[PDB]
């Protein structure tokens, strides 16, 4: 995946707080109604 903040590839929920899908909470579908509305 790609970082929420570094803008780098090679990223995951353990490389940073979240991938670009989120920033912290990173649940499987929450972003479309909270973090990406
Ligand atoms: Zn990062
Ligand atoms: Zn979130």
Output the six-digit token pair for 26.
């990173």
Considering only CA atoms, which of 11, 32, 30, 29 is closest in space to residue 20?
A: 11
Tally of domains in the chain: 1
Compute the half-sphere exposure of residue 31: CA atoms within 13 Å on the CB side of its CA: 14
Tell me phi and psi for residue 31, to 5 degrees: -60, -40
CA of 20 to the centre of ligand 2 (A): 10
Q: Is 17 exposed, middle or buried (0-12, 13-18, 19+ CB in 10 A)?
A: middle
CA of 25 to the centre of ligand 1 (A): 15
Residue 37 C-alpha to ligand 1 middle, in angstroms? 22
Range of the domain at 19: 1-25
Q: Please list, in sequence order, all residues whose beta carbon lies within 8 angstroms of the beta carbon of residue 19, skipping any fewer than 6 positions away.
A: 1, 2, 3, 4, 11, 12, 13, 26
Structural domain includes residue 17 = yes
Residue 31: inside a domain, yes or no? no
Beta partners for residue 34, in sequence order:
none
Nearest to 23 by CA among 37, 9, 36, 33: 36
């Amino acid at each position: 995946q790609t970082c929420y903040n570094c803008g780098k590839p090679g990223h995951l929920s353990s490389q940073c707080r979240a991938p670009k899908v989120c920033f912290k909470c990173k649940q499987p579908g929450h972003f479309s109604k909270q973090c990406r509305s």
